[PDB]
Each structure stands twice: as C-alpha cells, then as structure tokens.
Design a protein around this ligand. Structure first.
Ligand SMILES: [Zn+2]
Length: 188
C-alpha cells in the first residue's frame, strides 16, 4: 500500500511545504481504474467517517461535515480509467476519453494559509468529447503513485478550475472494497 510518507511528505500532505519542494509528475502516477466515492456517501456508508470527525471536531456538526463532503463528492462520473496516457470518464452508460498532455502544476495558497498542488492536463484532441481541462490534486507534491485523488474538470480555462473550492469528484481504487474505503478515510 505504498511506502510510508516521510515527515516532509506528511507535512506537505497537511498543506505545509515550500515551493522548492514541489516537483513535476506524470499522468502514470494516477494509472488504474478508479471509483467515485459519491455513491458511498449517498448510501450512508461514509457516515461513520463523518461521525468520527464530528466527535473529534467540537466546532463542526455532523451535518456541516457531511454537507462539506456532499458538495465535494457530487458527480455522475462513476468511474475513471487511466492507462497509457489516456484518461477515460464513465458518466452513466456513456464514455469519453482523451490522451491528455501535461501542462505542469500550480501551487495554491488557501484562505486558511495551508497550501496544495494541482497537476494540470489539457485535451488537445479535437475529436474528443472529454473535458478540455483537468487537474489532479491528491495531497502529493512529487512523483509517487496516488492512493486516491480529487479531480477538477472543465471546458473554460485552467484558472477557472483553480478557482474551484467546493466541488471535487473524489476517486479511490476500483478494486478497493467499500469497507477499506471507509477505513482509509478514518485511519488515513
Ligand atoms: Zn483527499
């Protein structure tokens, strides 16, 4: 399940790192078949996660937490498959795909002061119907296989996506059982 993170990596994941620490990554870091976690939230299976967080965070109610993740996870792209430079999106019973080109990364500084890195990709295949712009965010700032990721998709501009803060379709390995998904969110 991937090597334990170093102190640096753990800090980075927690939004603490300096620009010089950030490095470029390849689309292969996200290779695999991924499932959207939105269904688990709609089914109530993620409730134990929000229950735990609410008991731990006296300033947040269960509803506030679940609502945060509700806005965050919402999506109709149930599955995402990534292989050999091609990202494919499954919305309902229809698929779109593009051989995305890497456009680099962007380091964002959040209103709370914490930081995070977005890895940008762009679709330049005119026949494609997939999103023109996409961004991966997974609490990682240097080459390493992702364990789960948040993806931003759009057709206007990369800046537009950088402006997004509430919706972020989240994906975990398709092979991962639902019980393991809950464990990972609660255990980290
Ligand atoms: Zn995350």
């Amino acid at each position: 399940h991937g090597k334990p993170l170093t102190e640096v990596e753990q800090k980075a994941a927690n939004g603490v790192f300096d620009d010089a620490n950030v490095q470029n990554r390849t689309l292969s870091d996200w290779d695999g078949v991924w499932q959207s976690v939105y269904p688990l939230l709609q089914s109530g299976k993620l409730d134990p996660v929000f229950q735990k967080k609410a008991d731990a965070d006296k300033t947040k109610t269960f509803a506030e937490i679940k609502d945060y993740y509700h806005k965050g996870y919402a999506t109709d792209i149930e599955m995402i498959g990534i292989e050999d430079g091609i990202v494919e999106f499954h919305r309902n019973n229809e698929t779109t795909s593009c051989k995305y080109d890497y456009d680099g990364y962007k380091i964002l500084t959040y209103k709370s002061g914490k930081k995070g890195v977005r890895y940008l990709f762009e679709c330049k295949d005119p026949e494609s119907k997939a999103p023109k712009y996409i961004q991966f965010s997974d609490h990682i700032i240097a080459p390493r296989k992702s364990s789960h990721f948040h993806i931003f998709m759009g057709n206007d501009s990369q800046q537009s996506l950088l402006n997004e803060m509430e919706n972020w379709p989240t994906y975990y390995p398709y092979q991962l059982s639902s019980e393991e998904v809950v464990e990972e969110m609660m255990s980290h």
